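Following up on my earlier message about dodecyl-beta-D-maltoside. Here are the inputs again, as you asked, copied directly from the submission form:
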Amino acid sequence: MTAAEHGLHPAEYPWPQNGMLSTFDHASLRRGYQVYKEVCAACHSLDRIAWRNLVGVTHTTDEAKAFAEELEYDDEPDDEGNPRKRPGKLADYIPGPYPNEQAARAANQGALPPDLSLIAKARHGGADYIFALLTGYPDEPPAGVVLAPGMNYNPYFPGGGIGMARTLFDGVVEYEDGTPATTSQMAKDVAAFLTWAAEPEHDERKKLGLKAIIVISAMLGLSVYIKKFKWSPIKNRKFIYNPP
Amino acid sequence: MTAAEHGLHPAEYPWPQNGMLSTFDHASLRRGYQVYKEVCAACHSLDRIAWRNLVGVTHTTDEAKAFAEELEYDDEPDDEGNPRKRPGKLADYIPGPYPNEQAARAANQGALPPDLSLIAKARHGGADYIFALLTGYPDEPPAGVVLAPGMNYNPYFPGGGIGMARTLFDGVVEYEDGTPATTSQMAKDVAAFLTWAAEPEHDERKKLGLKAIIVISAMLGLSVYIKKFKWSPIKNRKFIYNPP
Amino acid sequence: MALRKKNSLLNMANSYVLDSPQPSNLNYFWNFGSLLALCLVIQLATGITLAMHYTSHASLAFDSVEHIMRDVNFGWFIRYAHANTASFFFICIYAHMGRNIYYGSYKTPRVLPWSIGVIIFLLLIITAFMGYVLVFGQMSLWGATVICNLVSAIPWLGEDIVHFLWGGFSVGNPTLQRFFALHYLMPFVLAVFALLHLIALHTAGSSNPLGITSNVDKLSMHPYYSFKDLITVFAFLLMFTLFVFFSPDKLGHPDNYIPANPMVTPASIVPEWYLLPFYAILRAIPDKLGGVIAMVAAILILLILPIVDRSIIRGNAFKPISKLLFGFFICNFLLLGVLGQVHIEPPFIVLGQICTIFYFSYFLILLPMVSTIENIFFYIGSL
Amino acid sequence: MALRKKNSLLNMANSYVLDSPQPSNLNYFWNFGSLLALCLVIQLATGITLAMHYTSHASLAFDSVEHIMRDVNFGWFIRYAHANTASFFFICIYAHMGRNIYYGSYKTPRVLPWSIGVIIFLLLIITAFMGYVLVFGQMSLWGATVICNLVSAIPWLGEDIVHFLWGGFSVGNPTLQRFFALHYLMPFVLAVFALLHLIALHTAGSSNPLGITSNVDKLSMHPYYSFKDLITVFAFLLMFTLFVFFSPDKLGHPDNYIPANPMVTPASIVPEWYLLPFYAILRAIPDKLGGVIAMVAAILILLILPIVDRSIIRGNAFKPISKLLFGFFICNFLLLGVLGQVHIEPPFIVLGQICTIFYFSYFLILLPMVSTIENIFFYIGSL
Amino acid sequence: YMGWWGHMGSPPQKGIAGYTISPFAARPFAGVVHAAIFNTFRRTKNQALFVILPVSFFYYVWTQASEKNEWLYTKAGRHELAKAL
Amino acid sequence: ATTFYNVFVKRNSAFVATILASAFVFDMTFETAIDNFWDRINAGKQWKDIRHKY
Ligand code: HEC
Ligand code: HEC
Ligand code: HEM
Ligand code: HEM
Ligand code: HEM
Ligand code: HEM
Ligand SMILES: CCCCCCCCCCCCO[C@@H]1O[C@H](CO)[C@@H](O[C@H]2O[C@H](CO)[C@@H](O)[C@H](O)[C@H]2O)[C@H](O)[C@H]1O
Ligand SMILES: CCCCCCCCCCCCO[C@@H]1O[C@H](CO)[C@@H](O[C@H]2O[C@H](CO)[C@@H](O)[C@H](O)[C@H]2O)[C@H](O)[C@H]1O
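Thanks, got it. Here's what our run produced:
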């Protein structure tokens, strides 16, 4: 296959979470949530994340309850069996922009924006792919490329023609922590947030792995001593043969 | 417990399907469907039965298709993702009278009319219970019985006070086969139909059982001959002992 | 040397099913072992098949069972076969245990197969209990609730253990899904223990109805017991046929055709018939923890038969008094079964207590006394 | 007599894990058997646990796996352990089979354990294939579609068989639910065959790296090989730890995190890495049926090693030419693996055909010729 | 306590001659009618009391208990029921 | 009897072939016979009996 059909391979960026002993940067996660909420959420759902999942990761209990309580969710029917709405709770999932696929495609010139909950695991490259894609729209497509209608040139996307336009421009978000919202900064934050969304156990997993590595290594060393200790009578065996 | 708390036990009626070798009377099943459709279906669903299930049991392919095609079912959303309705198909399930439990209870003074698909298996007595209940509303409750509001006296129902009023009266249905539609006739037909709805394999099951009984009995007889044949040298063994 | 003896794999099969030396006088009560193996094979075949069509999620479980009944080709048969064979499994196991107790199969040198057997019986109970819950009808839910709440009686940790077992604060979806996984597993564990008790038995061989050695007069397992087993296989299949094809719901509870509803409590919550005697024993003790202990002890007390039977003779064929006592013990066990399904009302409350006392006094008092006295009667009577 | 020898049950364990007489010179390649037993135990523990939280219905399957990852306590660990151990199981099984081929473990008198082993390998493939479908991601669905369509090549009845396997006209809910039931079952079948191949082995005992008898010099299995097995257990657990905790998705396909979509076809449909050599062999043959036969034959041809190896000496330790041939055979098998995941493009098409020819010619031509010549060289060279 | 064919663990056997005939040479159902009537009658008669006595006792006990329970939950049994609870 | 034994019984290959062929015949004829018997004892009741009205 041509390189175009594959898509350009993303650079390896030095993410804070790269490194056997490294967590996510939670300040970046919080900023990335804000990018999701103000930019991506217009077209993309995050259906696997509940308000409770943000708590103690990016937000306090109260901030997350406030986000949930601003929305209306379907309640159980009333006593006459008529539909009702209720305010959201921490248990509720973050609601998507569209009621169904058909509405999603109609709003996006036929293309379906994927749910972003697993997107960091569902693409080769992970965070690097997300970062490269969001920041990799050239002003002009390479001479000779013919884009299908409603397509945008992006070399990281396989085939080069993607139905998603460039969306991150300097200052589309005003970060609440005062960080300058450049294209690069927002792409880095949202890519970090989406990586967390795909693997929320990440931080705990790596810490438990450190404990396992240490215990297992020590046990491996001790098992070598014990094996050698037990085997030494066999290894050290000597013979004298006197032919009968 | 008091007999009242248990409910009066229904008589054993001689159903056509009683009898190891007996099928349902399919003419009675068809009439019972008509009772269901014109009387019970106002309050009771039959959610486990599809239009295809009637075919070759009570109705032809065409009659059942006609029943399905008169109704509207939810289709897949259109291209703008807006809801649509379609006409029914044989694959569709018979629709219930109420959208939910709350609407059902509101229409029935708080009581919930059960789905009737399994009712013949879900009550002690089966067809006999259904027949006895429908035909067992006395004109007057036994002196001393205090009915709760919205309750009707029926001795077959445990406790005696049932939220369902008497519904079968002579000539509420006009049968399409000319059968006189008396209370008793309609109760018998609908009880037969509901028994079929609970166990649609009934006819086939009993015929396969006849085949199994015959084969297994013959094999049992032959296994006795073969065992006795093989064992006769052991059974017939004789000894002469001469003490050494 | 014949291949069946030479090849180590073939020789293992040979040692159990072909050359296996059997007493020449086994009666028809020795046929329940192979019927239990048949029930196990039927349950595995039908159970694995049901698992191909069943959905363990609480929102779909009851409906998946209706789908099996209505849409799956021969689904009705596979479902009814599985449900009815669970009952037949208990009939056969009670007959097998009854045979073992009457003929002294628990005595030395067969203490180990008997003791493993007691564990098989416990595994069967757990297997059948969990399988019943899978339907997620009213009896499924409420039976699970009541039975799992018995664990709350464990001091200090009981409540925590119950929530752990449920995976939540009541019986729900997490409970159903774990019961499915464990119901699938437990029959394999049961097969292993069944094999273990046979390997343990193989050191002494089968006992026989006379209670004497059969080392003097052995018969090959095949063809003699192979063809004798076929008779009871076909008798079993006739009984199976009558239930599965002609009366498939006779042994069941109509309330299990109502979907589970945590709000509405069924009129009476009873276990399946084969657990009823143990339920009666539990009810007899007023204390919660007392009741649970008594119920468990009613099964574990089988382990002491090798000790409390003081007879110098194996089995009851020649013991008139022990035969009478055995008869009363069995009928009492059936009465306990009946009392397990009556309402908690006079005069059944006191009757259940008397029958419970009799059940335990068989092991603890009557069998040790009767067996001691019969020893003396044999000796003096034959002087 | 010691209880471990006297009691028949204890004596069976004793004969396999304690008093079992082993050669004194087993090298570390004899440790893969116990690693395979470890993988099997991990898969049973993690698999049964996943089954407590997984829903086999196609509308809920993918979401139930996300529920395991996100909501179940340590669900991520149990899931990643199960997924990664499936890969480790194949690494260990290839190492074990490699050991067997290099050291002539297939030769008389060990033809039977080797032949049962070939069946174990087939059962592992089927087990792992079905487990992979259970996720119901894109690779799950499309992998099931293409692999099950190979059955359509069976003449006359092929199409009917596929629809029968699927329970419908394409891979859907019926397929998923039956794969769950059979995925649960197959590891138990595999455990039985693993036990059978060990019982078959016990007649000759383990071979050893020299290929000579060890009857002259035996060591008890315990403590020597018990403690030697612990070293590789901890080395295995270190590798396990690095994948499960630090790189849990390294061995997987990102497309399996996309829910199954019968409309959209993934860019490339490849099997899991451990099946890739057999996929390359299939591609090499242009005919559909031809390809299926070749793929199956690539495994069944292992059964003829006892015949085509004409050597008078067991194993390769002393055979320079056989060792070189073995090296080329192994590297060719790895190249086939690589070619299973390239695109069907020049020049990989012809290369795959050459490597396929080499794979089969090892069994049919090279090993019979090389082993014949080495016999002559040993005899003439030592005159 | 059990050996195998050739060394089953029997005390030494001597002086017993055993005879039998081929299954093909024998009538498998010889004397079946006599056995089915007279042997079964003998066999059943000798065991009858061990079944009859416990069955009849426990059936009587059940019958009395179930009849009392039924009577206690009638109008007539109101007072006796009040005492029993 | 000798002839019958020699052809169909003596060789187990032939005996098994005869048993299987007989099972095939039995299966087909038994099916037909039960179908007819079932239809006669349940005459007038089955769908096939009322189908003509519709
Ligand atoms: C107004 C529309 C719109 C906005 C705003 C938007 N997207 Fe998208 N996105 C799409 C559409 C449409 C697709 C599908 C493109 C295709 O498949 O051709 C898509 C695809 C993607 C993909 C997957 C590309 C692939 O490999 O399949 C990722 C990752 C993505 N978007 C992330 C984001 C992030 C991160 C943001 C903002 C911070 C964002 N999107 C904002 C419409 C949008
Ligand atoms: C307009 C209302 C209404 C009509 C018409 C009606 N039902 Fe019902 N039915 C109910 C209600 C309400 C209940 C619940 C009663 C209760 O639980 O107290 C009920 C309960 C039942 C029960 C279950 C009683 C039990 O044991 O729980 C059966 C069976 C039944 N109906 C059958 C029928 C049949 C057959 C027909 C007509 C041919 C019929 N019903 C017509 C309202 C109706
Ligand atoms: C000792 C063996 C077994 C026993 C005693 C047993 C018992 C039971 C019982 C009593 C039920 C409830 C039946 C009902 O009323 O509907 C049941 C259901 C079930 N069993 Fe088993 N079972 C056994 C083996 C198995 C096996 C090996 C499987 C393999 C999965 C299995 C799968 C099921 C399933 C899926 C159901 C639920 C569907 C249904 O109710 O029919 N069973 N079992
Ligand atoms: C899955 C359940 C079981 C199976 C398949 C099974 C199978 C068998 C078989 C085939 C035999 C040898 C033949 C026979 O005597 O019937 C046997 C014997 C025996 N079983 Fe079981 N059994 C099971 C459960 C039990 C239980 C629950 C017990 C005890 C509580 C038990 C105790 C024994 C004993 C003591 C013997 C030796 C009896 C004798 O020959 O004297 N078994 N079993
Ligand atoms: C679940 C998979 C398996 C397990 C748990 C297993 C386990 C074992 C164990 C514990 C041993 C004895 C110790 C050792 O040599 O490593 C052994 C030996 C053997 N296995 Fe396996 N094995 C498995 C699969 C296979 C397969 C797939 C084959 C062949 C294609 C095979 C063929 C053999 C042979 C021939 C031996 C004897 C080797 C010798 O000592 O010379 N096994 N296996
Ligand atoms: C030889 C043993 C086994 C092997 C090689 C094996 C292999 C696999 C594989 C490759 C998968 C796909 C994993 C993924 O990518 O997510 C899987 C999934 C699964 N396996 Fe197994 N498995 C084995 C034993 C078992 C057992 C005994 C169970 C008991 C039910 C089981 C239950 C599951 C379940 C529920 C899943 C789906 C959830 C998931 O993907 O993690 N497995 N298995
Ligand atoms: C029941 C289904 C059939 C499958 C077999 C069951 C699997 C269990 C077998 C494994 C347990 C080991 O089983 C054990 O095998 C050996 C030989 O095979 C038997 O050994 C017995 O037979 C052989 C010859 O037949 C004699 O050399 C020996 O003197 C005698 O004791 C043991 O008595 C038995 O306990
Ligand atoms: C590896 C998993 C651990 C569990 C062990 C596997 C369980 C099933 C194994 C039983 C199968 C029968 O296995 C068979 O048992 C007998 C006694 O136990 C062994 O017999 C061996 O040991 C005993 C003493 O230890 C000697 O009397 C005998 O001369 C010798 O051959 C056989 O060599 C073995 O093949």
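One observation from looking it over: The first strand of chain C starts at residue 21 and ends at 23. Hope that helps, and feel free to reply on this thread.
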